[PDB]
Amino acid sequence: KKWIRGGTVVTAADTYQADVLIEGERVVAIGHQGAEEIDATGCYVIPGGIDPHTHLDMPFGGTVTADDFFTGTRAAAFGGTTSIVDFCLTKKGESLKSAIATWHEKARGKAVIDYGFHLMIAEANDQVLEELESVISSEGITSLKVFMAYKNVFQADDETLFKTLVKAKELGALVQVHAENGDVLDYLTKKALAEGNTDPIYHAYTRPPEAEGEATGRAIALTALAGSQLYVVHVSCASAVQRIAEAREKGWNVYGETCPQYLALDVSIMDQPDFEGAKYVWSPPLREKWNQEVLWSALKNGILQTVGSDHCPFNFRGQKELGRGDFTKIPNGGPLIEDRLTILYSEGVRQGRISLNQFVDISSTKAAKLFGMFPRKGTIAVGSDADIVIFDPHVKRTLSVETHHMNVDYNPFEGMEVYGEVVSVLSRGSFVVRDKQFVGQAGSGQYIKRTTFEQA
């Protein structure tokens, strides 16, 4: 038994002042009038972040991502996030269970906060189409990623894409896509080398917005044809929001996600001199600052509805260095998991782009309702896991590597001045972070078995 009193609680809908009362793992009562007191006067009390886009301990390049399931989830916790959903990678000619098996073992004993999996799909031949039944019922997985890019590495063709969509329809699974046209990026990529333009800046100009716009449109069209449901990850540009908007107007179930770096960084930052740009090499690439406004408008009027990190990080030394000679080899990815919550707060709420209620919905709730974790996760209500987060909106602080908790040598928002700080984080009503201290234990994270798809 724990007792948060003095708090002003904020949810996707509500904003009020009241004591919440945790017992065991769950919120149990809320209101006025022997248990561990915890004072939250003047702080906001909010549901735990959920970050539906993670790659902890992933291979990409001949190397692996810096954070593991321990360092990763700690950093998430430190930065306000209580549940992640990571991407389990399948390998063509591929016992689907032996993949999942591997991703469980990647977490077991390391994770400190709760976590679920998405399942990647590489080919959709009969073998795989079969296993999918077992996994959705037995293995607690109900969302499926197909990459339309990374040619000859993760890329699916329209066939796989469609078959998966129709099966997803049949089973109750959310298909997710990385919507860039592999084929056109490859050419532009191999051409930019032909000409000897090998700086990291050309990672950005070798995958122009028109190519995200295109795959997004495409993946939407099949969804339409299939009668299934879509969730485009990491929408970075206007070309794509446009296509998403358009379909949602016709009433199809298409969904949208961004990350902070597309809300708060632009391409100019890549054009820097000493390989500094490689700090920004990730896919889709950063975009002209015009786009940030559109992405934000989308979040505000409910056109995009979730935000994730696509945390997938590599050290500037040794790892990002892997391709000084050429940007093909820079392992694509950023360290984004920790600051996500608070840049949403500071750049969005604090400067009048979204409401405080929307800030919760965008970072926590809506992701739960789309990924089948609701109401166990993503709200403060009676019954819900006590993934609470006490949050001080008044702090002014500067984001830096010197002070972040991710296991990486840099921070892409380095030097950015920001409001708001995470004071303490509960996970199922145990402290993971208290007064800004890691009091958690590795292995305390539980897998979350998610339910099948349902609307919002």
Which residue positions form the known binding site for Mn(2+)?
A: 53, 55, 145, 178, 234, 310
CB of 107 to Mn ion, least distance (A): 17
186 binds, among a copy of itself, Mn ion, none (CB under 5 to 8 A by kind): a copy of itself
Residues contributing to the annotated binding site: 53, 55, 145, 178, 234, 310
Across-strand partners of 433?
425, 438
Nearer to Mn ion, 380 or 406 (CB): 406
User: Contact 120/89 with Cβ under 8 angstroms?
Assistant: yes
CB of 183 to a copy of itself, least distance (A): 4
User: Contact 311/380 with Cβ under 8 angstroms?
Assistant: no
Nearer to a copy of itself, 162 or 391 (CB): 162
310 binds, among Mn ion, a copy of itself, none (CB under 5 to 8 A by kind): Mn ion
Rounded CA separation 407/401 (Å):
10
Rounded CA separation 144/322 (Å):
30
Nearer to a copy of itself, 183 or 392 (CB): 183
**Which residue of this chain has its Cβ atom nearest to Mn ion in the complex?**
178
Residue 329, CA distances (Å) to 189, 192, 312 in order:
11, 14, 15
CB of 217 to a copy of itself, least distance (A): 6
Q: Does 207 bind Mn ion (CB under 5 A)?
A: no
CB of 426 to a copy of itself, least distance (A): 47
178 binds, among Mn ion, a copy of itself, none (CB under 5 to 8 A by kind): Mn ion
Range 153-156 contact pairs with CB under 8 angstroms and sequence separation of 24 or more: 154/89, 154/120, 154/122, 154/178, 155/182, 156/121, 156/122, 156/123, 156/124
Give one DSSP letter per residue of 234-275, joined into a string: ---SHHHHHHHHHHHHTT--EEEEE-HHHHH--GGGG--SSS
Rounded CA separation 9/21 (Å):
12
| Residues lying near a copy of itself in the complex (CB under 8 A) | 157-159, 161-163, 166, 181-184, 186-188, 208, 210-211, 213-214, 217-218, 221-222, 224-225
Nearer to a copy of itself, 224 or 356 (CB): 224
Rounded CA separation 277/251 (Å):
40
Rounded CA separation 38/7 (Å):
10
CB of 249 to Mn ion, least distance (A): 26
433 binds, among Mn ion, a copy of itself, none (CB under 5 to 8 A by kind): none
CB of 230 to a copy of itself, least distance (A): 14
For residue 70, give every residue at least 6 positions away whose Cβ sits within 8 Å of its Cβ, in sequence order, or none.
110, 111, 112, 442
CB of 96 to a copy of itself, least distance (A): 21
Site for Mn ion in 289-328 (CB under 5 A): 310
Site for Mn ion in 146-185 (CB under 5 A): 178
Nearer to a copy of itself, 182 or 348 (CB): 182
For residue 313, give every residue at least 6 positions away whose Cβ sits within 8 Å of its Cβ, in sequence order, or none.
65, 66, 67, 333, 334, 335, 336, 406, 408
What are the residues binding Mn ion (CB under 5 A)?
178, 310
